Amino acid sequence: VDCERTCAQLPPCFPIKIPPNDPRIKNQRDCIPFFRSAPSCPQNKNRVRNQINALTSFVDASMVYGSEVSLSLRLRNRTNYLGLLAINQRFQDNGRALLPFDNLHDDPCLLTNRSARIPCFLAGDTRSTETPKLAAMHTLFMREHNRLATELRRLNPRWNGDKLYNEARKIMGAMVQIITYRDFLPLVLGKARARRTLGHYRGYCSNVDPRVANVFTLAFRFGHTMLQPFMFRLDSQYRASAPNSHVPLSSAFFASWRIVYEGGIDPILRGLMATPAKLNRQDAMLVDELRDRLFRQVRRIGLDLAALNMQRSRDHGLPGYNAWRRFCGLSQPRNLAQLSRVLKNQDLARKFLNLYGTPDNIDIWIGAIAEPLLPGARVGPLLACLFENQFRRARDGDRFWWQKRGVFTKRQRKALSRISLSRIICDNTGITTVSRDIFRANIYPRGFVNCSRIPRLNLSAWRGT
Amino acid sequence: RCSDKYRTITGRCNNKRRPLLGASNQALARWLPAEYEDGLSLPFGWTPSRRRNGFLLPLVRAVSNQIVRFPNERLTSDRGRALMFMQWGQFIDHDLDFSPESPA
Ligand code: HEB
Ligand SMILES: *[C@@H]1O[C@H](CO)[C@@H](O[C@@H]2O[C@H](CO)[C@@H](O)[C@H](O)[C@H]2NC(C)=O)[C@H](O)[C@H]1NC(C)=O
Ligand SMILES: *[C@@H]1O[C@H](CO)[C@@H](O)[C@H](O)[C@H]1NC(C)=O
Ligand SMILES: [Ca+2]
Ligand SMILES: [Cl-]
Ligand SMILES: [Cl-]
């Protein structure tokens, strides 16, 4: 049945019920819709249910290229042999490329501004327009692929279209791995902690299982606590001068029309560099733009992302908080006194026990994001353990890890080591002043430099290879 | 024969002895055994009266209302991280995993 149009507990639904004291939803028979995740290999019925991962577990830029062959070809520009990704044929952003449009039945982007009639963008992953901030990243990386294939053609005029696409794709996968492991993970975990728990790369291990685990798909939603209530857009002087510079997120979900008609991706990229993230605090976890107004412009009711995350771990048959603490070699608090020490917060521990009775039953996302943050990190110990486990596997179990001997040449690894997300912005946008340490909060003009000061990717090591 | 120069699109052939490891369209790995109300597929919370470890489960929306919800005066910006840090996290999450929903 259509879980958006009934609150009955009929297949494949698992509706989120409304409490009597709800501060927002006052219809006691309403629900927040919820479709269960599809089961893997549905033929066997007496087996324990598992959920599917539709994407490649490797950090390989599959969100740009696709994880299915037919989709990966659909994203390519098939009108020439330049090895490019297809671009929007109707709109451009100050002369620069935009993503092609998708062709969805009941396209949600069309519902965000009925008169603009701008559908969702098409990229390697189905969620590319969940915000215009995420669509801006997808657009930026599609441009970087085309810039790489264009420069590789200049160096290698006899390479065919497939070789140009394959080589640009291989460089892009390495850049995504470098930005992730060198820049992002040390700031999630703490720099010393990332060095100690991930360690230096020692080579490929064919006995490592690189698959993404079911629990990681819930734990890595810790990011939801870092959203501010607005999408921030800034002009070329990094000022919120336009009259709609602070867009509430609940009017920006799926709003591809904002990229097409409200200034392209540069104001969005500038907003991301120059605005601080929200800090996860135990008494300020998730903004109401996500906890109460999620997707309100495209669904019959504003959803609650925290409720979806907790219902989703139940849907996915995940063990509770203490089972995951035990998996990580952490203590299993059994009562109020112990939970108060683990959370460094008696009032929060009391609220958890009033709701759950035992910490054994706390749903993984809420218990994990409630842990106090480790010094230098944006995670407590449980999320640090789970993320270290997943990212260690994704690196050590990947036969195409960028540092593995034979994947790239020594000269190519040296050239790749100079890349940065700031350089990708400089190379593919009209922005000429960027933050150098892009993931740190930089209050403009502090930490911002001209693009000429940011190292470049020298592609000479790809000539004649 | 798996290639030694380029990745496949689907991730197949990254592990030569177990070619589907890490490939798309497969079951998510489990780091611990699954826990369902009936031991097979019904989620905990499916039957309101079915206890987990001897206790009734709260409504996920009640947990959200009582613990997650907060007023504007407590919103705190992170002095050490830009929104670009958050955005890289969503973007890399979309390189790693997506569980499709069951259709209507
Ligand atoms: C709208 C929205 C945003 C940005 C405004 C967002 C952000 C993040 C960030 C920053 C993440 C990690 C650093 C992150 C990870 C994951 N998300 Fe979240 N996210 C948004 C919305 C959603 C919605 C809706 C879902 C699905 C909820 C449900 O269970 O019904 C969601 C999920 C995820 C996932 C799981 C992906 C999967 O494997 O299916 C991750 C890892 N986000 N998001
Ligand atoms: C395939 O690539 C070509 C070459 O880059 C694209 O051609 C550009 O098309 C736009 C209009 O869509 C023109 O304004 C440009 O002047 C063209 N550039 C050149 C050098 O010819 C073409 O759009 C791409 N096709 C697809 C489907 O992505
Ligand atoms: C919808 O988009 C059009 C541009 O096509 C714009 O003029 C209009 O203001 C938008 N509507 C809203 C509510 O922002
Ligand atoms: Ca991937
Ligand atoms: Cl809010
Ligand atoms: Cl798991």
Author numbering:
A (entry chain B): 251 to 715
B (entry chain A): 140 to 243
Task: Provide text from the study.
Eosinophil peroxidase (EPO) is the most abundant granule protein exocytosed by eosinophils, specialized human phagocytes. Released EPO catalyzes the formation of reactive oxidants from bromide, thiocyanate, and nitrite that kill tissue-invading parasites. Mature EPO, purified from leukocytes, is a highly cationic 77 kDa monomeric glycoprotein. Together with myeloperoxidase (MPO), lactoperoxidase (LPO), thyroid peroxidase and peroxidasin EPO belongs to the peroxidase–cyclooxygenase superfamily.
Here, we present the first crystal structure of mature leukocyte EPO at 1.6 Å resolution together with analyses of its posttranslational modifications and biochemical properties. EPO crystallized in space group P212121 with one monomer per asymmetric unit. Each EPO molecule contains an N-terminal light (L, R140–R244/V245) and C-terminal heavy (H, G250/V251–T715) chain resulting from the inaccurate removal of a four, five, or six residue long peptide (V/AFTA/G) from proEPO during proteolytic processing as suggested by mass spectrometry (MS). In the X-ray crystallographic model of EPO, the last clearly resolved residue at the C-terminal end of the light chain is Arg244 and the first residue of the N-terminal residue of the H-chain is Val251. In accordance with sequence predictions, the crystal structure of EPO shows electron density for six disulfide intrachain bridges. In the crystal structure of EPO one N-acetylglucosamine (GlcNAc) moiety was clearly resolved at Asn363. At Asn327 we observed electron density for two GlcNAc molecules as well as residual density showing the presence of additional glycan moieties, which could not be modeled. The electron density map clearly shows that both ester bonds are fully established, that is, between Asp232 and a hydroxymethyl group on pyrrole ring C as well as between Glu380 and a hydroxymethyl group on pyrrole ring A. By contrast, the electron density for the ester linkage to glutamate in MPO and LPO is weak and suggests a split conformation altering the pyrrole ring A environment. In the crystal structure of EPO, a water molecule (W1) acts as a weak distal ligand of the heme iron. In the X-ray crystal structure of EPO, a citrate buffer molecule is coordinated between the crystal waters of the active site and Arg549.
